[PDB]
Amino acid sequence: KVFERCELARTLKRLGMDGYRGISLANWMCLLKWESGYNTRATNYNAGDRSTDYGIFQINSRYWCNDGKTPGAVNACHLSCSALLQDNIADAVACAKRVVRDPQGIRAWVAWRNRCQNRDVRQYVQGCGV
């Protein structure tokens, strides 16, 4: 599923993402926009280390989910990576909350640092009723 902007903003709000661990909705929206263009079946293979990024958050298989084909990987969200390819984003959201419970927080995603950090991200939630 490819979410429309405001539809996604309210979906995240309903799932408890607004201000989760100090992360605003606008930050999450900017992350998802740049990570997958709000696409839940987006997937990316990393040939350098044999890992794969899954779904709307582009969560990596080396540490967060199990796909059975990433060498020496772990599964911190205790989910099959297939769970991160569903149209329903509840499981991916639970995993993204798990990711930010770590020290780095939202900084876990390099893309967020590149195009969200220290930027005006207000535009991502404007007019969405959140």
Curated annotation (Swiss-Prot):
Task: Report the residue ranges that make up the C-type lysozyme domain in this protein.
Answer: 1-130
Q: Which UniProt keywords apply?
A: Amyloid, Amyloidosis, Antimicrobial, Bacteriolytic enzyme, Disease variant, Disulfide bond, Glycosidase, Hydrolase, Secreted, Signal
The active site lies at: 35, 53
This enzyme's EC code(s): 3.2.1.17
Q: Which superkingdom, per the lineage?
A: Eukaryota
Cellular component, GO, one term: tertiary granule lumen
One Pfam family recorded for the sequence: Lys
Protein localization: Secreted
Q: Name one GO biological process term.
A: inflammatory response
Reactions listed under catalytic activity: Hydrolysis of (1->4)-beta-linkages between N-acetylmuramic acid and N-acetyl-D-glucosamine residues in a peptidoglycan and between N-acetyl-D-glucosamine residues in chitodextrins
What is the disulfide pattern of this chain? 6-128, 30-116, 65-81, 77-95
Query: What PROSITE patterns has UniProt attached to this entry?
Result: GLYCOSYL_HYDROL_F22_1, GLYCOSYL_HYDROL_F22_2
* Any GO molecular function: lysozyme activity
Q: Which InterPro entries match?
A: Glyco_hydro_22, Glyco_hydro_22_CS, Glyco_hydro_22_lys, Lysozyme-like_dom_sf
Q: Which disease is it linked to?
A: Amyloidosis, hereditary systemic 5: A form of hereditary systemic amyloidosis, a disorder characterized by amyloid deposition in multiple tissues resulting in a wide clinical spectrum. AMYLD5 primarily affects the viscera, and the predominant clinical features are renal dysfunction of varying severity, and intra-abdominal bleeding. Inheritance is autosomal dominant.
Q: What else is known?
A: Lysozyme C is capable of both hydrolysis and transglycosylation; it also shows a slight esterase activity. It acts rapidly on both peptide-substituted and unsubstituted peptidoglycan, and slowly on chitin oligosaccharides.
Name the family the entry cites: Belongs to the glycosyl hydrolase 22 family.
- Described function: Lysozymes have primarily a bacteriolytic function; those in tissues and body fluids are associated with the monocyte-macrophage system and enhance the activity of immunoagents.
What does the subunit section of this Swiss-Prot or TrEMBL entry state?
Answer: Monomer.
Could you identify this protein by its name? Lysozyme C
